Amino acid sequence: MIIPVRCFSCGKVVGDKWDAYLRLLEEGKQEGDALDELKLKRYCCRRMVLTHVDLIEKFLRYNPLEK
Amino acid sequence: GVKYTCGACAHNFSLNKSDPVRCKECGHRVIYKARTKRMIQFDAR
Amino acid sequence: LAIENLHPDDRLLLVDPSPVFFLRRPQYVSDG
Amino acid sequence: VVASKASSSMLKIDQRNKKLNNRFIRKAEMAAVEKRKLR
Amino acid sequence: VAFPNQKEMVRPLFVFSDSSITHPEFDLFLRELDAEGLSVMDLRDVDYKYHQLKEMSSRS
Amino acid sequence: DDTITTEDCWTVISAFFEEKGLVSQQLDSFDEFMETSIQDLV
Amino acid sequence: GNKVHIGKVPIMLRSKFCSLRTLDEVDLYKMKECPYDMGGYFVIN
Ligand SMILES: [Zn+2]
Ligand SMILES: [Zn+2]
Secondary structure, eight states: OOOOSBOSSSOOBOTTSHHHHHHHHHTTOOHHHHHHHTTOOSHHHHHHHHTOOOOHHHHTTSOOSOO | OEEEEESSSOOEEEEOSSSOSSOTTTOOSOEEEOOOSSOOOOOOO | OOTTTSOHHHHHTOOOOOOOTTOOOOOSSOOO | OOOOHHHHHHHHHHHHHHHHHHHHHHHHHHHHHHHHHHO | OBOSSSOBOOOOGGGSOSSOOOHHHHHHHHHHHHHHTOOOOOHHHHHHHHHHHHHHHSOO | OOOOOHHHHHHHHHHHHHHSOSSHHHHHHHHHIIIIIHHHHO | OOOOOOOOOOOOTTSTTSTTSSSTTHHHHHTTOOTTOOOOOOOOO
């Protein structure tokens, strides 16, 4: 739904690296190189950013219920 | 006495248990109650 | 220019101190 | 629509990745099939 | 609407202010009415207006 | 010409799913029922 | 003798006679419909 704050397995904070990851991918870097540049060594952390699906961008497209 | 919110235009209003269930300005048939004024607390766990 | 435009002999100088068909690059929109 | 910046970036990444996959996977398959043929 | 001293005016609704009428404002309105030679609404008519507004606001 | 690989087969399958969809049979059957079947039943 | 009303036939969603066949992508969100919904079912009661 939205990038988790901590890695499930170990507990490293990965919630502050989603925007940087997208910026790096925008510049043409490969996914492995982008994850390496963010200093994500353990594959337990790498799966958190690699396999995250961002669904909040789909929930936000609905008109807000209040105003 | 109790607030309500329209389901389309999100317009706040109130009803007196005798008005027809309808938004006053767009005539929508579906309305929602507003959130309670009580305190809501969560354990952050 | 890129790695392809490099001379083959100079490419041979790039030695690690090939793609495989079953490692896709991840996507987000898929298709259909 | 006025799409958000993150969605536009994701769309660009998806287009690039689709092109790169369509090239590299096809090249690898062509490389493998000829080797399997000559064996 | 119309000021007593001034003439008739057609105005939109938002021109009026939610703030209450002050003592000098009502005094000036009374002085303008006296200058024109007009009177104030009767207390019976004031009650009739109040009942009309209460009926209209609480109507279903 | 040139040989056909697996990726070309997946391109063709992608075209199939782009046109048809996954529930095309339900919608096609209902459209046939509404367009012509009711009139013939009458 | 003219158009006499004989009944009401339920409409399969996303079919040719559904209101969602048109409306593109943007209006599908304003109607609170998921663009991933595929149709093919009826809505009875
Ligand atoms: Zn970890
Ligand atoms: Zn409304």
